[PDB]
């Protein structure tokens, strides 16, 4: 499972941002989720059901692949959850559908601080919210 992580990262212009993969300046609608080529992705891809879920590299058939997203055949099949977020190869946060459940609360997940560094000082709360007709428990990060 671990090497279903695409790890194509190049600090390039912005320096230092890649440290956030390991450890710890501040609005148009996103496009819908599609099939993302793994070669553009650096680190884990998260989708939100609204609860956070990691999506690993597959081929275009959905068959899992285990080559750290290094191949042209490596993709993320994101079209189904409500949205997804990831870091691209040069350090830009990408969204499709961030995972805001409230104007001031975001879904919390292991790479929130890397993908959304301007939420560093938000507080984590155990919350419950109605999505469709389905109650969900999750952890959220709020102003």
């Amino acid at each position, epitope marked *: 499972h*671990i*090497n279903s*992580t*695409a*790890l*194509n*990262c*190049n*600090e390039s212009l912005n*320096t*230092g941002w*890649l*440290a956030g*993969l*390991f*450890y710890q300046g501040c609005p148009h609608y996103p496009r819908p989720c599609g099939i993302v080529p793994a070669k553009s992705v*650096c680190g884990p891809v998260y989708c939100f059901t609204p609860s956070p879920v990691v999506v690993g590299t597959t081929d275009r058939s959905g068959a899992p692949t285990y*080559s*750290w*997203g*290094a191949n042209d055949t490596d993709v993320f099949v994101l079209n189904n959850w409500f949205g997804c977020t990831w870091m691209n190869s040069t350090g830009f946060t990408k969204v499709c559908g961030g995972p805001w459940i409230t104007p001031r609360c975001m879904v919390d997940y292991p790479y929130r601080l890397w993908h959304y560094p301007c939420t560093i000082n938000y507080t984590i709360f155990k919350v419950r919210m109605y999505v469709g007709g389905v109650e969900h428990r999750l952890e959220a990060a709020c102003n």
Partner: antibody, heavy 126, light 106 residues
Framework: QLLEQSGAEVKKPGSSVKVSCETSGGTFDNYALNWVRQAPGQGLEWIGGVVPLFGTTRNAQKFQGRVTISDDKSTGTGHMELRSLRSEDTAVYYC????????????????????WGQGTLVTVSS | ELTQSPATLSVSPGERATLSCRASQSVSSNLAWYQQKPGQAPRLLIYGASTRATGIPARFSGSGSGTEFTLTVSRLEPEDSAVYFCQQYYRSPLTFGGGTKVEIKR
């Protein structure tokens, strides 16, 4: 930050040696442990390294199959085991730790070497 | 693979020392310089071809990109007697230059 390596060693050809790399204070934030050696009169040669978060390793070709590099994230103690020692392996071995990664490519990461151990002389002799 | 020429340098205190690293193939800016004083481990001076590492005096300065790189020590002092190695982290395997040993005149 100070890296402290185990003391010098002497080994018969064909034997194995394990060198340790301990951090003076507590552990600190670093993403890779690598090992670098220097023949007594010569320059610097990269052996290999490990990125513990992903559990990946790279080795130079001269060491393919006989080196195991590992890192204890709880204690902050790293290790290089070198097997099948030959006399050409006599060298000062250096532990190095890197803090800020500069590029990654599946599934290993690379950058400058921030911190160096003081070095461990390993002599291989009959 | 990295070439440092000349392998030795002999320079007077107060003057400027210029060291050369040539890569056989582009390494872009993924190049570091280290200093190894007698009997000590190397210490990092420069990374990303031109960025000074923390705690390094400003008279150490790097430049270059691609295949041609230069470490400049301005106003040499006795403590700078050392071997200086370049190193590239552009592609695997990581490689080091052979070193230039700087002697300080007196």
């Amino acid at each position: 930050q100070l890296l402290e390596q185990s003391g010098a060693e002497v080994k018969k050809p064909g034997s194995s040696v394990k060198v340790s790399c301990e951090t003076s204070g507590g552990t600190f934030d670093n993403y890779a442990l690598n090992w670098v050696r220097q023949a007594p009169g010569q320059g610097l040669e990269w052996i290999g390294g490990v990125v513990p978060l992903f559990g990946t390793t790279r080795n130079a070709q001269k060491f393919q199959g006989r080196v195991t590099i590992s890192d204890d994230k709880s204690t902050g103690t790293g290790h290089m085991e070198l097997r099948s020692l030959r006399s050409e392996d006599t060298a000062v071995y250096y532990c190095v730790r890197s803090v800020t990664p500069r590029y990654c490519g599946g599934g290993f990461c690379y950058g400058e070497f921030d911190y160096w151990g003081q070095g461990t002389l390993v002599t291989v002799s009959s | 693979e990295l070439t440092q020429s000349p392998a030795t340098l002999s320079v007077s205190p107060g003057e400027r020392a210029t060291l050369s690293c040539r890569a056989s193939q582009s390494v872009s800016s993924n190049l570091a310089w280290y200093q190894q004083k007698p009997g000590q481990a190397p210490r990092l001076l420069i990374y990303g071809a031109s960025t000074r590492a923390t705690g390094i005096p400003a008279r150490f300065s790097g430049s270059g990109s691609g295949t041609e790189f230069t470490l400049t020590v301005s106003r040499l002092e006795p403590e700078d007697s050392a071997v200086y190695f370049c190193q590239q982290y552009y592609r695997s395997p990581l490689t080091f230059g052979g070193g230039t040993k700087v002697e300080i005149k007196r």
